[PDB]
Assembly symmetry: C3
Homo-oligomer: 441 residues x 3
Amino acid sequence: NITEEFYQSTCSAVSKGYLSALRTGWYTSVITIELSNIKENGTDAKVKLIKQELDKYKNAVTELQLLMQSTPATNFLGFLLGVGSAIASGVAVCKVLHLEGEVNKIKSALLSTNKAVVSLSNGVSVLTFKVLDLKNYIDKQLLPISCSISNIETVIEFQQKNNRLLEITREFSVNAGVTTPVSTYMLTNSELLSLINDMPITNDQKKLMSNNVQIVRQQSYSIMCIIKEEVLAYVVQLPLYGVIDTPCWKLHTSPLCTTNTKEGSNICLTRTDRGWYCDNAGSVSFFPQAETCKVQSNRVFCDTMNSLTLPSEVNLCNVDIFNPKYDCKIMTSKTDVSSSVITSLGAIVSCYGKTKCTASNKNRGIIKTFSNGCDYVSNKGVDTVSVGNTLYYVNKQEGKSLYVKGEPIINFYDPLVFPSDEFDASISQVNEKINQSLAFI
Amino acid sequence: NITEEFYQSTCSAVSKGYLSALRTGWYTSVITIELSNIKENGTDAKVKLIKQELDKYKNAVTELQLLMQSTPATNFLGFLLGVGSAIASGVAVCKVLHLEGEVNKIKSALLSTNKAVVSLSNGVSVLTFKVLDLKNYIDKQLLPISCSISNIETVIEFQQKNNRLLEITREFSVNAGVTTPVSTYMLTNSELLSLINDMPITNDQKKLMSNNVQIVRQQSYSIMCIIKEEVLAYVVQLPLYGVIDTPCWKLHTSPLCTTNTKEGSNICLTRTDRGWYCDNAGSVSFFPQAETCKVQSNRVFCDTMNSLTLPSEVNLCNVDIFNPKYDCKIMTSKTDVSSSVITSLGAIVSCYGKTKCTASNKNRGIIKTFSNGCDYVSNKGVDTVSVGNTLYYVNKQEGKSLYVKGEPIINFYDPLVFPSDEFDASISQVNEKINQSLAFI
Amino acid sequence: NITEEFYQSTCSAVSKGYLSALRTGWYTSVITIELSNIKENGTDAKVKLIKQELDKYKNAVTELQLLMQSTPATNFLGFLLGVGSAIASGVAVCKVLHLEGEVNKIKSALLSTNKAVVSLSNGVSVLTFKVLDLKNYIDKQLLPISCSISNIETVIEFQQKNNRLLEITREFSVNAGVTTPVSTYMLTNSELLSLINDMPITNDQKKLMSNNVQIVRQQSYSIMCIIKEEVLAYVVQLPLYGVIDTPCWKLHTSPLCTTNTKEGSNICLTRTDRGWYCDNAGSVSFFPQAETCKVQSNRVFCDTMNSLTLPSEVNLCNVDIFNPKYDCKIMTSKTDVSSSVITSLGAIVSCYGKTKCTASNKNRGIIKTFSNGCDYVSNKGVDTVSVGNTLYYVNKQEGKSLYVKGEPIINFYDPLVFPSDEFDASISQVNEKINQSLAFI
Ligand SMILES: NCc1ccc2c(c1)nc(CN1C(=O)C3(CC3)c3ccc(F)cc31)n2CCCC(F)(F)F
């Protein structure tokens, strides 16, 4: 049940009714591919193709080890975020895989099975998985072949069993050994689902991760790890969703300006706290770059690494931007340029100057003509909005919007003492500089 | 015919002579792949490869339907842009494809042909296309085979007919069901050209889209839609070029500073209205992030979603930044750091402090040494420019440049009342704060 | 040997002990694929697959020539950077490849060999390489076949020799003819190593490029060039590392604020000169967007195109932000929001207001609770840090950190005349505006 409210006073709008799925942690699993260690050794069509396909395989392994000479690594209010190192946990697991006893502990565990939990040197209890077993395939098939007795049906199956290794080597070659999203060459869809189900989390988390496999992939890393003792290992680091099903809402803001006819005499004001907001642990997790969050249906997947933690009182700026409990961030300027923001259920139109702004329908064209100022229209009955030479399609998801009539707060400011060009400001910072210019006049 | 003009007064330069191709709208087509619906059912080399290849095919379909549990969705002056939702129109078409009568209307239309126009439930008249027909290939070939009579020539063709489905499933698995650019696994080059030619637009638009297929791809989305009644459907959303062949020009700006020898006593000023500009409908479409526009030869492909609509008088800032009709956006600072901007036909050099700035040639090395200030050099006779430890190659496209001698407007400002650290400012906003500090002294 | 120092006075930290590898230039090589020029010409299983595979090949060539109708092109303090055009040098080489005598000079040189140096029309002496030779493979095999005598072993090898051409055509189709990173479909790992070794540079540069092939790929471009006289040519533009093994260090900064209990009465200050720093030619190459630099082990790969050149005295801001030789860039605000930055060897915590900030260990959970202010913890003994609802993993690379006790310089400022909302400012710019408000009171 999605709903929306537009605040004419502050030229902003909130879509609510969403449910959270915030990545709060990481699970590191160790994916392995058992490798054949052969020295190369007549000519004809069918195993000259095999000699070709295997040189592809040895080259894949020698470029992987060449690739692993160094430890793996990777590269409005968004500037306020901290700075994490996404794969630090995965790199930590991969580091202990280099210790002597460690590589063969894993080799041992998956001799009898393909999925097993291993508790490693430093206490980490990871899930390991053997996804391809080239070594016995090669040993028990290719190795037997003095070099000429074979048939084309095996050339083809060798090409297919090997192709996955070739394509993994590939991804890592153009990614300096860290890929994201994680592909099914790293982890097939059934391999991932199975790893998810074997992951010791709640069954709620299992159902959620299983129902949005495409999202789990986009939020995972595949870290190229080690090649040692005929086992190829790379860590797949998967999201932990520690916050599930808390309320979420998306705040859209657009510039609110005066509309005087003498151009350049106008003052503008924009709320800068736009982004995604989700209740989380008694505070509000705020995501200023609303493009980092993936939305599926009414579920919002976000990464706390890209969040600020705010008092829940931040929600007060939507009904009363002048509330005494929280100082609402705004920016100011004199640049009154037209534009529109396409909300979940409608469109905010900031129309200024000589700009043409309309909203139209599929069959009839124009049904509303916005006059100067900041206005809003619901996506019921409206298919497109135009501001200047820019046509915007509105989202056609169903849900009810609500227009909250109020006086534009830009009117409360005297233009001759209004501080223009303020960015990371707030209602109270603007008032304090107004009182200082008013005293000195 | 490309030309360039450098304005020494404002340390900026304009390349002109380009032609526009602005994406103004979207065309939504429905691409379909007919699927075989079989229950799986002796062992030997050749159809154990077929049993392998088909399990790949059923897994491809079940992960696609698993993927489609939720409705599809996706993620100086650039901050001034509005906010669209790129695939809103495609998602709207895909939504009506879920209605009962809709899926089989398409199934019906392409029983006799591969390309057909269908008018859908809500009045949308889309082009639909059947690009692969696995169902009859499987039914009329694989289905007949008690499970062992076959030959290797069919294993291979099955692998190839199926591979496209495997690779489409693929793209959608790492992209949460929306890909861009659109690949020829989604739409082969001949499929796209044919869809373009069958698209009811002008023949001018057809020739343009046909001559820049690589660009159309980068500006399209492929939206994974529905799997229902043995038909796999995904919407391909293509650009509409409503503005073609209007004048375009690119504005390059660099910081203009005073050059006093006591370091820190300098004041700088930078025009912030850099980007692409194209005449469009009596206004000027302005693109502040000049990297969103693709340029092929002298044609500029841009997306109005990333544009502001400005009065054509914005062009006045290039000959007279002090003109009374338009208030030209500048930023100010005291940070005089050296740098260079590589224009279409030359290079702007902002050289300040103790920085070394030169321009060299292939055979002779250095031919010009820039002194402190803001200067420019044409790409005729010059192959590289160096500012500090940074070597810049200049573009070698041919065209004539013109050096417009003028006094650097930074000289007109008194440093003791100059407002530093202003960003979204203008000539008139800077003057109004100068008059206020001058009154209070 | 990595070390780190945290300056409590300015809430920042420097990791040092790294070695540079700065891309200073470009080497342009010409990669070629000899093509067969055939007119197409009974039906059965095995060469209906060949007629299929070859139509894939002719379509690949006609879409490549269609693609080449236009000349190739491509798209805190980071705003201070200049603006280069990355592929200008490659495009210049590709342009002279269109001149009449040029294409056949290359055709000539590699008739007897696969790798040869050619000196071109304008004096450029490039390395050219023939990586695939479809023409003689087709001519001496496929051409002989009236259209039915063949066997499946050749269908398969044709599919494999051709696949590389198909996949190159591919990359260029979704990239408008310029790809980066460069793949081994463009340049196999042994082809690249060999091209690197045949490149006339120092053996130091050869060893470095050979030991980080994955990095060279990420820093290279593949520019689709020309199809003319049965030769397909695309330029691969590779990095030149003119600066090697100079000291590097990474500066991390976080906001430093007062901690008064009346919320909103606080003033903050953040050093804005964070990024990578490497000694280079007597100045310091400064990289403000620290994500453009790839780090392998203790080697830092960077691109001078994304650098500023600063006086080496910029290093003075780390021991004495008030030093008289260099004016240290800071920003100011009143927005005291909590966050943490994860350094190479520890974590900076800026904890303000009612935020919970801790640092924990694998086995014991919480071991430190940060109080309001800006603090730091080393990664020895600590595995994670939490600030609000955000969990950060710290890097587990080994190295020693050093905590430099000092008084937070935010205390030296009187809050009633502190200029908030300054961004591109400096210690001296802040003091000069303080003296102006203090005079007028
Ligand atoms: N502590 C006060 C403070 C905080 C942040 C500030 C600032 C002052 N001034 C700027 C410069 N600025 C911009 O970047 C934009 C978004 C385009 C803009 C819009 C209007 C405006 F008035 C200024 C700005 N920023 C942001 C730097 C962001 C970067 F670091 F990521 F670049």
